[PDB]
């Protein structure tokens, strides 16, 4: 401490680093191999290609590009491999830390959610895509054993099937009310309304003001509409 003070009198892994260090390594190498006359004008576009490749990996979009030199495409691929491995590994690494109660600070709490939801949605998509190939796993001999059980249960119970709600029905009003208010009560504690919530309040309100018209609309949706919005 003393020596440092006197000289100054006479003079005066981890998720944060590793990613930026990958960008810097790859950009360093690519810029080194470029001819220096065209070098700087392309460089920003190359950075954009790295960003787009990462955004496409985060979307599961395959990122297939029109004509490109093969070695660069290989490089960006291997980069996506390493940065992906670190992104997922650190995403799962921080989550258990949040579970234990250790302090990861804050922005990590907020980002870890988005990362784990990208991962969760990927697991769901791979689940269903492998359910394309192999088809349903039930098989007829097992579906038989399952279906006889319900058939025998409902026949033994002497159960009459539920009919379709009639155009003229006693409790329609008393079913609309209980339905609509259960969509309504979400907004009763709010002083202010986001744009969508206000639209939904318009929907419930017209559903009260025009009950016959909404009964007809619901019933036709039941008999008819097979296609729905995402």
């Amino acid at each position: 401490y003393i020596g440092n003070l006197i000289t100054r009198q006479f003079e005066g892994r981890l998720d944060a680093y590793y990613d930026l260090e990958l960008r810097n390594s790859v950009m360093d190498d690519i810029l080194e191999m470029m001819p220096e006359s065209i070098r700087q004008k392309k460089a920003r576009t190359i950075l954009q290609h790295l960003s787009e490749a990462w955004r496409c990996w985060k979307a599961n979009i395959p990122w297939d590009v029109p004509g490109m030199p093969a070695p660069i495409k290989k490089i960006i691929e291997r980069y996506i491999k390493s940065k992906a491995d670190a992104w997922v590994s650190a995403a799962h690494y921080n989550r258990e830390r949040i579970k234990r109660g250790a302090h990861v600070e804050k922005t990590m709490v907020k980002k870890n959610l988005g990362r784990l939801t990208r991962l969760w949605i990927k697991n769901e998509q791979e689940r269903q895509r492998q359910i394309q190939k192999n088809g349903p796993e039930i098989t007829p001999e097992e579906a038989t054993t399952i279906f006889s059980v319900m058939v025998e249960w409902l026949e033994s119970r002497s159960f009459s099937p539920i009919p379709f709600p009639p155009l003229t029905y006693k409790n329609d009003t008393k079913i609309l009310v209980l339905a609509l208010e259960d969509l309504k009560d979400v907004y009763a504690s709010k002083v202010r309304l986001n744009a969508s919530e206000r639209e939904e309040l318009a929907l419930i309100e017209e559903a009260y003001d025009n009950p016959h018209d909404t009964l007809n609309r619901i019933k036709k949706y039941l008999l008819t509409q097979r296609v729905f919005k995402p």
Binding site: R55, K58, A59, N60, I61, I98, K99, G101, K106, V109, T117, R118, I121, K122, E124, Q125, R127, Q128, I131, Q132, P136, E137, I138, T139, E142, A143, T145, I146, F147, V149, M150, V151, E152, W153, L154, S156, R157, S158, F159, P161, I162, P163, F164, Y221, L222, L223, Q225, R226, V227, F228, K229, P230
Partner: protein, 386 residues
């Protein structure tokens, strides 16, 4: 999840339901009992529609079944990502619960079968109450005695005599030979309770447990759901084990008969005196505790309060702690005073929020902070916090 029973009232009627049936407590000749807790695993996620449209056309006219079946495809979007839902169920739909419940009504019928399910429910003319029968003969006719399903989780109670039990366990041991006595490696004890109140590991009772879970494992196909020994808890009451252990909702209950109280016992706050409808005496004590799940949910919730607020008011922090703490005291009422670590976490978390206020006023922190600041009502200007 019936309309008439609040889940703590459910746990109550479940314990009283276990006692009110005849002579499970006597071990005098060879008798024992077993509880299972098994989550059905992937259930709504493995729901398959080609089976649903049929099972629904059983219960409902086809136009509603077709609507319900096609309404689950849709397309699913999160920002960039999009996938059509072919396989699993979307439980964000208002009617999903119905399907889910109805779907469970299938699996309940593979375990119980027509014969025993008719004994549990009763005739359509005079169906039974939640826990009842008509004659004791119908109770004792089948090993399965009490059965419930709460959403995914299943509760199954068995009463065995050596005649019946020796058979079942000899079958499992026979078809899964274990010479090294490894049945007790993976068996899952309840970590909350001390030694004397846990499940003692003895070849007889463990072999019974794994035999039971091996039978019921076989009863359900693997296409519907996935039942695994890891998610399951098995309690055995016999000569060796005085304790009947289960966990319903967020509660953990142990049960002792007054008969076996000789093994070391210490009274708690959560003590439930249980009364047979005939002797009208107190034949059992059910001790209560809070689960390690919903204690850690409370940890993570007060953590969420002190984290997710970068900049908020002080009265919002006080009101979030008031809400979450009112919910925990309100649902868990008796079981809290019996939990040491939950009282400890309460004491830590409250002073911790007070520290978040203090660090919000000034960076130096005080020596002592008068409590009338925190604890006066909101109308007098304090935080109103409890």
């Amino acid at each position: 999840p019936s309309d008439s029973e609040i889940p703590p009232l459910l746990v109550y009627k479940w314990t009283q339901g276990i006692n009110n049936l005849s002579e499970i407590w006597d071990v005098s000749r060879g008798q024992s009992a077993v509880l299972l807790e098994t989550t059905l695993g992937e259930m709504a996620e493995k729901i398959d529609f080609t089976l649903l449209n049929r099972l629904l056309r059983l219960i409902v006219d086809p136009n509603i079944a077709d609507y319900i079946t096609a309404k689950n495809n849709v397309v699913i979007n999160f920002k960039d990502m999009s996938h059509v839902n072919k396989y699993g169920l979307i439980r964000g739909l208002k009617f999903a619960s119905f399907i889910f419940q109805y779907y469970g009504l299938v699996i309940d019928l593979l375990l119980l079968g027509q014969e025993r399910a008719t004994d549990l429910a009763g005739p359509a003319n005079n169906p039974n109450e939640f826990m009842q029968f008509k004659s004791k003969e119908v109770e004792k006719a089948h090993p399965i005695r009490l059965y419930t399903r709460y959403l995914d989780r299943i509760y199954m109670l068995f009463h065995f005599e050596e005649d019946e039990g020796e058979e079942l366990t000899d079958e499992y041991l026979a078809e899964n030979p274990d010479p090294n006595f490894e049945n007790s490696i993976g068996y899952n004890n309840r970590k909350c309770w001390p030694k004397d109140s846990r499940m003692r590991l003895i070849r007889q009772d463990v072999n019974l447990g794994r035999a039971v879970f091996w039978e019921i494992q076989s009863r359900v196909p693997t296409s519907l759901t996935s039942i695994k020994w890891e998610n399951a808890f098995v309690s055995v009451y016999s000569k060796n084990n005085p304790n009947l252990l289960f966990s319903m909702c967020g509660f953990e209950v142990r049960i002792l008969p007054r008969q076996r109280m000789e093994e070391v016992v210490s009274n708690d706050e959560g003590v439930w005196d249980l009364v047979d409808e005939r002797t009208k005496q107190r034949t059992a004590k059910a001790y209560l505790k809070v689960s390690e799940e919903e204690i850690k949910k409370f940890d993570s919730r007060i953590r969420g309060i002190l984290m997710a607020s970068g900049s908020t008011t002080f009265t919002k922090v006080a009101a979030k702690w008031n809400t979450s703490l009112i919910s925990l005291f309100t649902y868990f009422r008796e079981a809290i005073v019996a939990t040491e670590p939950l009282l400890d976490i309460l004491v830590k978390g409250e002073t911790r929020i007070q520290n978040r206020v203090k660090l919000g006023l000034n960076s130096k922190m005080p020596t002592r902070f008068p409590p009338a600041v925190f604890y006066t009502p909101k109308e007098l200007g304090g935080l109103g916090m409890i």
